[PDB]
Task: inverse folding
């Protein structure tokens, strides 16, 4: 009772976050699990790992329901999009029981921090052409760059843009999007990977390497449908590579001293929670978060808004020449839904289980 | 190591929160012998408390060093070293090595010493008259029992003026000592019945025929280190007569004295000192000027002392030996007669006088202590200066500088807990007060009416000693880095 | 934390529940069991708490309350002591609540501070009636008979207690000055007053009944060393050449004793008092002189002898002075084949002696507590004469005025002061359980008494109804009631100031 | 079985009550905290309503069953404010168990609270008054914002002052010999996932829950006097010769029973089971709107509104199977609203009784469940609100106002019931005390103001004016002196009258408990 | 409290290194042969990779991925 029941919800949130802590970014390593049936699952996708893992805990299934909503909203780049909600849920309230702060007051402070965070994203973001094929082609190669099809991406990008512009024209007001479930997903095994109205249906001959390769094709192809869809929903394009968390961290620290009040500490607490996202990009790339994160605050603020973390060598480079860009809805639809799902779990006081249905 | 080791300190860190503040409280500790001790000073409790974890003993000995040397405001800085290890928990996930931790606190400690000299006000060059002593007693009460601040105000100030060698002009730091003032425990009577005697008082009951004369004066003190039975009667009668021929009213003897020798001493009414302790014996050598003579004989005036008069009175209902000088030159001589109900209240006032007299000795030894805002008032402006100090020199050590400023937030956090105030409400009030000269004379107000407004320290006269503040940070920072500098806990063979 | 204090108060209230039948004459004695098989059954809390095994260290505060009760006040252990911890009982639900006891300690402190002015306001000055030491002390003596087992037979004790303190000097009154001799067996009405120094118990050896008990004018003599032949003498180194040399030691020891007793015999004292016991060597020597001799004199007895005759302990015959030889007007030896020295005609003696006799040893132990409590009543009455009704009903009228100051608070301390007035209702509640009366019936008329009569409302216990103890000639010193709240203030503030305890090993 | 004796068996139920009391006290007020319960299947639910918590609360003592019956009783009486009603019965047993220990008899407290509550009706009626300072529908608007208690969606009540309030204004009907009534359950609650909760739309009529699948159904409908046809019938061997006999006749009978409804002039047909595409072909040529996969319970509310009578199967007094036109209902028009690719049938202009519906939108099912039962519980309050125009001031300030009335009432009765009245008034101070715990405020500071300000009107003479206080009073969020009359917070008379009267009767059965007798189960 | 996380060391290696010394003896033309015996007495003796993994049962979960 009291604050003891909330410890189990925070501890289980940190235990799951430790598994996905290194799963952020294209350099994410592999994780292994075991089941009582004797099998195992080995993949670099944090969404597929958390979906197969089933544990006994009241708030464990509630966190997975947040990913189901984001799958329809984004669904692409689960390492850079979906699993980021786990790190926010653990670090949203680093000091709670020790400070004895009313959680409802924190929620009111999280809403003010989330509202100001969405404004900072719109400042650093810039609009791009929605009808430009060369602009979206470089965006398709962003999420699919984790495979060997980078050189063969000419065939993957061809099947992508052709399936996006096939019909559309289904919305005049709240985008010109449609449903991709009517498109035939049937693939032909064998061969090489290189080889008004309603929604119509169209298909193109596609051949994979083997049966296990066909499952990897839907990763670099069906997930690319959200690349052009995120541009049609939000033409504004924002810097990627973890550059958004550095700008918000500076604004939350400066605006905290201006607002003052009892919410000053919970206001800037979101900044410390967002700093864990770029830390994974630094560790997996071979960098040192100690020296780099100190320089990222000054460079991404005074230097320019394009400063970000290099996903390869781990150095500090600009996202203009980095070649990867994240649409606005990547950070917007993630953090907004992450805080709303985190507030519902923080409001839980006591839990009495094991009775009946 | 650092972990469980710090968590074990957090148990005493939260337990000692009541040891400081004007609303602070005492605690009950029981030793292995069953003796109970009720006091608000953690230095006395941790001395008799059995310590398990080895590194905690270093923290205990570090706090006891301030009690032996400074001994002024040690309750306020008692938990200061505990928070320094608490802010290091955030540095664990950051990966900062203990080298940058020591360099972060060391550079900020030297910067803090320069900030205390800029904000110091109210230089006191007197340190003599009681008007300056009454202002020094108020901060002592702020860290101690708040029951009566009027009694200890006139009780301590009057005793310091007596031991002070008052003359026409006394310069060059006139001599002052804590052992020169002794508190006599008297059971019974209200706390307001405590008086001050310019002489020295002994605890003992004479056999009888106490001295009834005063104005006649003329008193002296002598400090000492069948035929066979008939010879002792002549020798004792001769040795006791030769001493009485010199007019010796009081005899101090450390050896044994039979009832036959005390019989002839009752003829002239000569009192004897039965206290075996050397404290009362060596004190009379510095006042009366008597040299201990092992043999009896006829002591020459070189070994004989001089005391004003001898009078025996009943304070708490029992006869006690009281040496009092009504009129004459009195220097380095004084005592405090304490009236109390139970020994629980006697030890609380004892620690108040022991630290109160030590506060005067610690004030007079340096050229001056001036005045510094106390009761958590000074630490508010320090956070603003340290915050700008980190941004002044950006780098890897800036993160350790921020943790050094957060370590000072435990003092206002502790004051709100003892007074029942909400730290979430009080923190922005002090953040909107001392932050943007009105911040020198302003301080935090601790009272039931503090919710309406925050009163300054000008009318409350709550201050802090600059000499102890500089040394408290030096000991707390070094002790915190010492625990972090411990590599591993390894036992010893044999 | 606050949960540990609840367990600490419940341990203190547990013994207070058994100490309820004390305040008031209708209280009932409490039985205790010690490890020595010797117990004292009494309403006194100082004796019970001293022999009671203490478990929690905070429970030792109740022992210090009784120690401070006798030092600061000197009586009221059956009344004030049990009420020193009643404020913690009403503060028990406040501990579970978020209310900080820091404001609670200030709430009771400001409440007892304004109550002292109310006690002095209702205090009646008897000096206008020109009441002497007879009518004033007699009405206060019957009030002291509360909590005492003796009630109907207490009329004989009133005459003895008043006449004993008036014979003692009224400028200096102390329990250590006046002597108390408890003699087991016999009857209570056989107690008498002694005008002079009396021996501790008695000394019976060799001839006893052969000593006449009727003397004219004996004289007191003081001695130091013990007298005996080759037994208690001081050991010394003596060279013995032959067995026949032992006869020289007998002569050397006797002549040393004989010359000292012959030189002091010139004083002509009929009473021989030595610091140590007296042997048969001096007994037969004093038998030829037909003089009385008694040894084994305690240090407390010699201090009272100096106040009368002005004698001093003489270790040798060279210091004997005529000023150390006194006399007495009449000497008579008083029970169970035990002689009791009784001195008379000592106007210069500043000490008194009272002879107590009773069948039960436990009952006479409370009589000694009655003597110590009665002297403190007489001492504080002669210094300042004030009339306060006893029986714990004084705080009843005071509680009404305390509620007036609470309405002027308008703060967190408003409900705290109301809890202090509610704690005063525990006094009549504990009295109804002792006499079997209905507590609700008394509390209903208690709140209706201050609305009409005001003044003094005493709840007379004799008529089984409501009344005034002022018209019943029940008087109590005000200094006992004023310091009653001071003893409870330091006791309540001490326990509330300890949030945790530490016990090693 | 065995039996446990002594007075400790009563304290066993009190400690068990205090154990579950502090659990539900955390959900009291908007500053409170929600709780999560598990069905031990692995699934969980999030609700702050005590009626659901006590239903899922396992208590082997009979004291827990009384709380279940009390929660279910307040659902029909009020339906909301469970934390402001059921929790009152918790501390009622705590203070009653304190007096009965020594000098108080169990029946004295029973008769003490009974006489006090009986005389408190006149004291409540003094504070009770008709709705004032309200223009038009603002009476329910100010009460709709009061949902912050026991319901945590009260922060969104600004937009809910329209959809919720206007929902029960159009359900007004006249029955029971000229008596205006508001039938419960007439408001159909629909759930959807998307956008935000601010997208909820009110439908002045019943909205059927279904989804349009086959495209053969007409996309447009017009005209008045639309007939509703409700049908629960399902319409969709050695040699093959025997199979052809039953197949050709079955296809003929199914298509014939459809034509029986066509001849009755039914514009829309509601079928419980599925409908084959061949049956929908007859609906296109006859301009009939087909609907399939309907819920039987959803069709029962249609019979009570439009009047369409459900038919199990085709039959008649003779051997011929047909469909009579008397089973058809009456509605003005049918509207098809497409919400997130889901089309629902909107029935408006009902005949027998008027109804409405509300569509909800949210993130997940847990976000909808917080918007479903909570808004439905607010509708039951409006049901009793518009029944009795008399209202009480909101904010839970009436308990502290009646304490000064009990102080003078304690001296009137007195005797042995005076101690029960003092504890009954002290129990009323616990309600604002718990509100200060979750709000991180000081209870002693607020209660001191509740006693000082609200009792100033009783001490002063009301005929001399000099009011100087409103007494009407407090403030939970800011801890400052403000008035709800200007802030629009008011509670109906149902929250107290016919509410706390039955709640204070729970101690009658508890104080008469002697021992516990438990029989070993089979 | 922090810390926790995990360390990459031989614990994860013990699963994948178990087959090393087992498959080292039969490597090459001078290697040995492994036998597979059932409860009925049938013995299949070969060092070929079919019996080394698919027909081999071991508590190490790493061998499942090595067999696949």
Result:
């Amino acid at each position: 009772t009291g604050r003891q029941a909330q410890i189990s919800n925070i501890t289980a949130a940190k235990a799951v976050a430790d598994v996905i802590r290194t799963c952020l970014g294209p350099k994410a390593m592999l994780k292994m699990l075991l089941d009582p049936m004797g099998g195992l699952v080995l993949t670099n996708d944090g969404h597929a790992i958390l979906r197969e893992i089933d544990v006994a805990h009241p708030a464990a299934k509630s966190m997975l329901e947040l990913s189901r909503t984001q799958d329809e909203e984004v669904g692409d780049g689960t390492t850079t999009v979906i699993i980021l909600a786990g790190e926010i849920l653990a670090q949203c309230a680093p000091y709670l029981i020790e400070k004895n702060i009313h959680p409802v007051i924190i929620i009111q402070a999280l809403k003010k921090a989330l509202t100001d965070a969405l404004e900072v994203i719109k400042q650093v973001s810039k609009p791009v052409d929605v009808e430009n094929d060369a602009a979206m082609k470089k965006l398709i190669q962003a999420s699919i760059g984790t495979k060997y099809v980078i050189h063969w991406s000419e065939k993957m990008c061809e099947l992508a843009l052709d399936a996006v512009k096939t019909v559309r024209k289904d919305l005049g007001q709240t985008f010109e999007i449609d449903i991709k479930r009517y498109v035939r997903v049937e693939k032909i095994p064998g061969g090489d990977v290189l080889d008004s109205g309603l929604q119509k249906a169209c298909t193109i001959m596609l051949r994979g390497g083997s049966k296990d390769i066909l499952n990897e094709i839907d990763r670099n192809l069906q997930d690319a449908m959200a690349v052009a869809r995120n541009v049609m929903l939000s033409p504004s394009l924002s810097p990627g590579g973890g550059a958004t968390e550095m700008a918000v961290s500076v604004k939350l620290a400066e605006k905290a001293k201006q607002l003052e009040g009892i919410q000053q500490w919970p206001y800037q607490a979101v900044a410390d929670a967002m700093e864990c996202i770029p830390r994974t990009l630094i560790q997996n790339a071979g960098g040192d978060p100690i020296r780099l994160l100190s320089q990222l605050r000054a460079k991404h603020a005074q230097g320019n808004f394009t400063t970000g973390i290099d996903g390869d060598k781990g150095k500090i480079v600009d996202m203009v020449s980095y070649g990867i860009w994240e649409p606005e809805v990547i950070k917007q639809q993630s953090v907004k839904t992450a805080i709303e799902s985190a507030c519902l779990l923080l409001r839980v006081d006591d839990i009495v289980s094991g009775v009946r249905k | 190591q650092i972990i469980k080791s710090i968590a074990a300190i957090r148990e005493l860190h939260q337990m000692c929160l009541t040891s400081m503040g004007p609303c602070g409280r005492n605690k009950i500790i029981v030793n292995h012998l069953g003796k109970i001790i009720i006091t608000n000073d953690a230095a006395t409790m941790l001395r008799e408390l059995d310590i398990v974890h080895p590194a905690v003993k270093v923290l205990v000995m570090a706090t006891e060093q301030q009690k032996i040397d400074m001994g002024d405001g040690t309750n306020l800085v008692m938990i200061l070293a505990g928070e320094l290890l608490n802010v290091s928990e955030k540095l664990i996930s950051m990966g900062l090595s203990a080298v940058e931790i020591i360099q972060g606190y060391n550079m900020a400690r030297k910067f803090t010493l320069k900030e205390l000299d800029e904000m110091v006000v109210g230089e006191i060059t007197d340190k003599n008259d009681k008007n300056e002593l009454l202002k020094m007693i108020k901060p002592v009460i702020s860290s101690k029992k708040y029951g009566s601040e009027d009694i200890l105000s006139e009780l301590v100030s009057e005793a310091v003026s007596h031991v002070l060698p008052v003359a026409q002009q006394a310069g060059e730091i006139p001599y002052f000592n804590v052992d020169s003032i002794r508190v006599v425990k008297i059971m019974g009577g209200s706390l307001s019945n405590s008086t001050v005697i310019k002489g020295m008082v002994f605890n003992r009951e004479p056999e009888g025929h106490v001295k009834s004369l005063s104005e006649d004066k003329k008193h002296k003190v002598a400090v000492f280190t069948l035929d066979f039975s008939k010879g002792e009667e002549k020798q004792i009668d001769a040795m006791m007569k030769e001493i009485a021929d010199m007019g010796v009213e009081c005899i101090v003897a450390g050896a044994g004295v039979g009832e036959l020798a005390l019989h002839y001493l009752n003829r002239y009414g000569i009192l004897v000192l039965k206290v075996p302790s050397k404290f009362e014996l060596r004190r009379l050598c510095r006042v009366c000027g008597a040299t201990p003579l092992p043999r009896l004989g006829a002591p020459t005036p070189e070994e004989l002392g001089l005391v004003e008069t001898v009078k025996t009175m009943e304070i708490g209902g029992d006869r006690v030996t009281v040496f009092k000088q009504e009129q004459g030159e009195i220097s380095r001589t004084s005592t405090i007669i304490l009236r109390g109900a139970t020994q629980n209240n006697l030890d609380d006032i004892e620690r108040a006088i022991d630290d109160g007299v030590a506060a005067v000795k610690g004030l007079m030894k340096p050229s001056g202590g001036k005045l510094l805002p106390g009761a958590g008032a000074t630490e508010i402006e320090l956070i603003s200066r340290i915050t700008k100090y980190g941004e002044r020199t950006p780098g890897l050590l800036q993160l350790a500088i921020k943790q050094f400023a957060v370590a000072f937030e435990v003092v206002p956090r502790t004051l709100a807990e003892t007074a029942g105030l909400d730290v979430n409400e009080v923190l922005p009030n002090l953040y909107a007060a001392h932050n943007v000269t009105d911040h020198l004379y302003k301080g935090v107000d601790i009272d039931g009416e503090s919710d309406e407004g925050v009163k300054d320290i000008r009318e409350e006269n709550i201050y802090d000693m600059l000499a102890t503040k500089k040394f408290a940070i030096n000991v707390a920072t070094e002790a915190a880095t010492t625990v972090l500098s411990i590599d591993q806990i390894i036992m010893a063979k044999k | 934390g606050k949960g540990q204090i609840i367990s600490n108060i419940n341990a203190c209230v547990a013994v207070q529940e058994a100490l309820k039948p004390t305040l008031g004459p209708l209280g009932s004695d409490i039985l205790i069991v010690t490890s020595n098989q010797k117990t004292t059954i009494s309403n006194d809390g100082a004796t019970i708490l001293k022999l009671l095994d203490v478990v929690h260290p905070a429970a030792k505060t109740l022992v210090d309350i009784s120690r401070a009760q006798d030092a600061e006040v000197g009586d009221g252990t059956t009344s004030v002591t049990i009420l020193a911890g009643e404020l913690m009982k009403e503060a028990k639900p406040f501990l579970e609540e978020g209310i900080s006891s820091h404001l609670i300690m200030k709430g009771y402190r400001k409440a007892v501070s304004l109550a002292v002015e109310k006690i002095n306001e209702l205090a009646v000055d008897i000096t206008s009636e020109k009441s002497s030491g007879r009518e004033l002390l007699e009405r206060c003596a019957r009030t002291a008979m509360s909590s005492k087992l003796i009630h109907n037979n207490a009329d004989f004790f009133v005459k003895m207690c008043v006449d004993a303190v008036l014979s003692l000097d009224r400028n200096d009154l102390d329990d250590k000055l006046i002597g108390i001799k408890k003699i087991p067996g016999g009857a209570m009405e056989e107690s008498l007053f002694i005008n002079g120094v009396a021996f501790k118990k008695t000394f019976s050896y060799a001839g006893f009944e052969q000593q006449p008990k009727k003397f004219n004018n004996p004289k007191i003599l003081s001695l130091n060393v013990e007298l005996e032949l080759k037994a208690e003498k001081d050991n010394a180194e003596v060279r013995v050449e032959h067995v026949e040399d032992y006869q020289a030691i007998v002569d050397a020891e006797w002549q040393l004793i004989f010359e000292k007793l012959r030189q002091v015999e010139e004083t002509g004292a009929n009473i021989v008092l030595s610091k140590l016991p007296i042997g048969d060597l001096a007994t037969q020597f004093f038998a030829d002189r037909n003089i009385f001799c008694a040894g084994r004199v305690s240090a407390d007895d010699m201090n009272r002898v100096i106040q009368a005759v002005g004698g001093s302990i003489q270790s040798t015959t060279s210091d004997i002075k005529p000023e150390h030889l006194g006399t007495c007007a009449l000497f008579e030896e008083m029970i169970g084949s035990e002689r009791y020295n009784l001195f008379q005609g000592c106007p210069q003696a500043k000490t008194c002696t009272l002879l107590l006799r009773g069948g039960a040893e436990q009952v006479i132990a409370e009589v000694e507590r009655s003597l110590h409590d009665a002297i403190m009543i007489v001492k504080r009455a002669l210094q300042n004469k004030l009339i306060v009704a006893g029986g714990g009903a004084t705080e009843m009228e005071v509680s009404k005025c305390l509620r007036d100051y609470s309405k002027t608070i308008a703060g967190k301390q408003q409900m705290i002061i109301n809890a202090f007035a509610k704690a005063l209702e525990v006094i009549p509640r504990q009295l109804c359980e002792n006499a079997g009366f209905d507590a609700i019936e008394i509390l209903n008329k208690l709140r209706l008494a201050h609305s009409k009569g005001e003044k003094w409302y005493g709840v007379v216990f004799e008529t089984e109804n409501i009344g005034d103890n002022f018209a019943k000639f029940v008087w109590e010193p005000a200094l006992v009631k004023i310091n009653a709240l001071n003893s409870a203030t330091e006791a309540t503030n001490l326990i509330l100031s300890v949030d945790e305890t530490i016990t090693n090993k | 079985g065995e039996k446990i004796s002594g007075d400790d068996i009563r304290n066993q139920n009190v400690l068990a009550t205090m154990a579950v009391a502090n659990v539900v006290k955390s959900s009291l007020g908007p500053v409170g905290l929600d709780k999560m319960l598990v069905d031990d299947i692995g699934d969980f639910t999030v609700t702050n309503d005590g009626a659901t918590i006590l239903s899922l609360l396992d208590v082997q003592h009979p004291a827990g069953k009384i709380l279940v019956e009390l929660a279910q009783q307040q659902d029909r009486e009020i339906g909301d404010g469970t934390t402001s009603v059921v929790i009152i019965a918790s501390e009622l047993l705590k203070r009653a168990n304190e007096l009965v220990k020594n000098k108080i008899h169990p029946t004295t407290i029973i008769t003490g609270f009974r006489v006090a509550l009986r005389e408190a009706i006149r004291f409540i009626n003094e504070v009770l008054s008709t709705s004032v300072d309200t223009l038009g529908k603002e009476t329910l608007i100010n009460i709709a914002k009061t949902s912050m208690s026991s319901k945590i969606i009260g922060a969104d009540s600004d937009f809910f002052s329209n959809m919720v309030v206007d929902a029960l204004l159009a359900v007004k009907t006249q029955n029971s010999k000229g008596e205006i009534k508001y039938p419960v359950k007439a408001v159909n609650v629909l759930k959807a996932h998307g956008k935000s909760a601010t997208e909820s739309l009110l439908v002045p009529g019943y909205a059927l829950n279904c989804t349009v699948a086959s495209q053969a159904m007409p996309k447009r409908i017009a005209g008045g006097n639309v007939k509703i046809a409700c049908l629960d019938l399902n319409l969709q061997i050695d040699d093959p010769e025997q199979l052809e006999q039953i197949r050709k006749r079955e296809a003929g009978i199914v298509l014939e029973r459809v034509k029986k409804i066509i001849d009755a002039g039914a514009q829309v047909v509601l079928t419980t089971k599925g409908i084959d595409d061949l049956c929908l072909k007859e609906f296109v040529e006859a301009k009939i709107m087909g609907v399939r996969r309907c819920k039987k319970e959803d069709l029962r509310r249609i019979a009570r509104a439009t009047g369409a009578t459900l038919v199990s199967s085709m039959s008649n007094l003779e051997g011929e199977e047909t469909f009579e036109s008397s089973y058809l209902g009456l509605c003005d028009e049918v509207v098809q609203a497409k919400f997130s690719d889901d089309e629902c049938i909107l029935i408006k202009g009902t005949s027998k009784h008027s109804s409405s519906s509300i569509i909800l939108r949210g993130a997940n099912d847990y976000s909808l469940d917080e918007m479903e039962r909570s808004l439905h519980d607010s509708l039951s309050v409006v049901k009793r609100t518009l029944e009795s125009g008399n209202v009480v001031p909101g904010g839970g300030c009436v308990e502290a106002a009646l304490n000064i009335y009990l102080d003078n009432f304690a001296t009137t009765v007195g005797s042995r019931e005076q101690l029960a009245i003092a504890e009954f008034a002290a129990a009323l101070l616990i309600i604002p005390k718990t509100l200060a715990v979750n709000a991180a405020k000081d209870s002693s500071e607020l209660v001191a103001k509740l006693r000082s300000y609200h009792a100033a009107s009783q001490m002063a003479k009301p005929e001399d004016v000099k009011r100087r206080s409103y007494r009407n009073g407090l403030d939970l969020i800011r801890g400052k002196i403000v008035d709800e009359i200007h802030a629009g917070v008011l509670e109906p008379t149902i929250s107290k009258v016919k509410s706390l009267k039955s709640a204070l009767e729970a101690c009658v059965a508890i104080l008469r408990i002697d021992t516990m007798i438990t029989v070993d189960p089979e | 409290e922090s810390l926790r996380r995990d360390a990459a060391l031989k614990v994860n290696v013990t699963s994948a290194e178990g087959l090393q010394s087992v498959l080292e003896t039969n490597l090459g033309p001078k290697g040995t042969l492994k036998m597979l015996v059932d409860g009925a007495g049938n013995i299949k003796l070969t060092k070929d990779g079919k019996v080394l993994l698919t027909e081999m049962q071991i508590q190490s979960p790493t061998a499942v991925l090595i067999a696949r």
In short: The radius of gyration of chain C is 29 Å.
